[PDB]
Amino acid sequence: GWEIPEPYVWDESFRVFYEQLDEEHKKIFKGIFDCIRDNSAPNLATLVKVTTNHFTHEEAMMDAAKYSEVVPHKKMHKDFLEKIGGLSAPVDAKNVDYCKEWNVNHIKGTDFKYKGKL
Ligand SMILES: [Cl-]
Ligand SMILES: [Cl-]
Numbered sequence: 001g002w003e004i005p006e007p008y009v010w011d012e013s014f015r016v017f018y019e020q021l022d023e024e025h026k027k028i029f030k031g032i033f034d035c036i037r038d039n040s041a042p043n044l045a046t047l048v049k050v051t052t053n054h055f056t057h058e059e060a061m062m063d064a065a066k067y068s069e070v071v072p073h074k075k076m077h078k079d080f081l082e083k084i085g086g087l088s089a090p091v092d093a094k095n096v097d098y099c100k101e102w103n104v105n106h107i108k109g110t111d112f113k114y115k116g117k118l
Contacts, residue, residue: 002108004100008033014107018118020062024054025107032099039090047099048085055081058111069113076110088105 005011010029015021015022031047055077062070080102 001101002102002104008036008100016111016115021058021061024050024057028054028103030104035091036096041089044087044089044091049080051084052081062114065118067114067117072108076106
């Protein structure tokens with residue numbers, strides 16, 4: 001799987017070259033980093049909010065582009081929001097690692113498929 005950054009921050013190897021989506025990816029790294037250091041109910045709900053907003057915006061750009069790999073991508077999105085929308089603070093160590101892993105793997109293994117296609 002790809003390297004999990006420590007400290008958990010965004011870096012350039014995650015760039016997709018669509019400014020607003022890259023800003024949103026940066027905020028999801030920050031959302032998870034904040035949950036890790038302050039595992040609170042506000043921080044978890046912020047992570048749910050920023051991730052939902054990002055997934056709606058990324059899916060709106062894939063649909064506008066008639067990007068042909070949008071439906072398995074949308075299911076990936078739906079499953080992750082279902083997972084973190086069901087969590088409650090403090091998130092245990094296993095689910096924190098799940099989120100860390102999932103965000104890295106999702107950007108590089110699935111969002112990278114739309115590079116230059118949106
Ligand atoms: Cl890499
Ligand atoms: Cl093309």
